[PDB]
Amino acid sequence: TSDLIPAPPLSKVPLQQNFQDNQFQGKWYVVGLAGNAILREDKDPQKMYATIYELKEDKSYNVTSVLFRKKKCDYWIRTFVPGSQPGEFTLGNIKSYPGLTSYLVRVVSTNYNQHAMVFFKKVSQNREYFKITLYGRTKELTSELKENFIRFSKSLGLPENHIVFPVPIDQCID
Numbered sequence: 113t114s115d116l117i118p119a120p121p122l123s124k125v126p127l128q129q130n131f132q133d134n135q136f137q138g139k140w141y142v143v144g145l146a147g148n149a150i151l152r153e154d155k156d157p158q159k160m161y162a163t164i165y166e167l168k169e170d171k172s173y174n175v176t177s178v179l180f181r182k183k184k185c186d187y188w189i190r191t192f193v194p195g196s197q198p199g200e201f202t203l204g205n206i207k208s209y210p211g212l213t214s215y216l217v218r219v220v221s222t223n224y225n226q227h228a229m230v231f232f233k234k235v236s237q238n239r240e241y242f243k244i245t246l247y248g249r250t251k252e253l254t255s256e257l258k259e260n261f262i263r264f265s266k267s268l269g270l271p272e273n274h275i276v277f278p279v280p281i282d283q284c285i286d
């Protein structure tokens with residue numbers, strides 16, 4: 113019913129040193145997308161989408177994804193609660209997602225004003241899913257940065273067809 117490439121040990125997912133949560137606020141474009149449930153589809157290629165991070169009084173993030181689907185904009189909202197160390201988070205109100213028993217976020221690297229790599233891992237219906245997002249402050253990033261993403265995705269066991277670069281669009285995400 114399902115076959116998944118295993119989640120890597122956390123020992124080989126770096127953590128961004130000295131994480132500045134206020135500086136990580138704002139809109140990010142998903143320019144690179146990889147994971148064990150992520151699969152390249154040339155018939156119907158992945159459209160680019162955007163994720164907005166905004167701190168609250170209590171320093172949790174209100175994370176809002178906006179994506180273009182069925183000729184409309186869909187708004188996926190959830191809370192990231194600070195975890196064991198800075199740059200590391202857990203999901204708030206996990207109770208509202210049936211089957212979901214675990215959720216981890218980890219900021220691998222970022223220069224705040226241009227690019228970022230973030231690692232996600234969830235366990236749901238006892239199935240362990242993980243993904244890496246290549247966040248871009250603009251819709252385009254350099255070749256260097258994208259290969260860096262490609263080769264990092266591979267260091268966690270992902271083949272080429274599990275790595276995608278969503279195609280830039282104008283609807284919803286601007």
Ligand SMILES: COC(=O)[C@H](CCCCN(O)C(C)=O)NC(=O)[C@@H](CCCCN(O)C(C)=O)NC(=O)c1cccc(O)c1O
Nearest residue numbers: 145147148149150179180181182186232233234241242243
């Ligand atoms: C992550 O971005 C994505 O491309 C889409 C977002 C959906 C947007 C679609 N839509 O609503 C639109 C276009 O309007 N979703 C995933 O690929 C799922 C696959 C696992 C599904 C688990 N599952 O329920 C099954 C049946 O396989 N998610 C993850 O792989 C995943 C892994 C770790 C942490 C997460 O939070 C995840 O979501």
Ligand SMILES: [Fe+3]
Nearest residue numbers: 188232234243
């Ligand atoms: Fe998700």
Ligand code: NA
Nearest residue numbers: 253254255256
């Ligand atoms: Na270049």
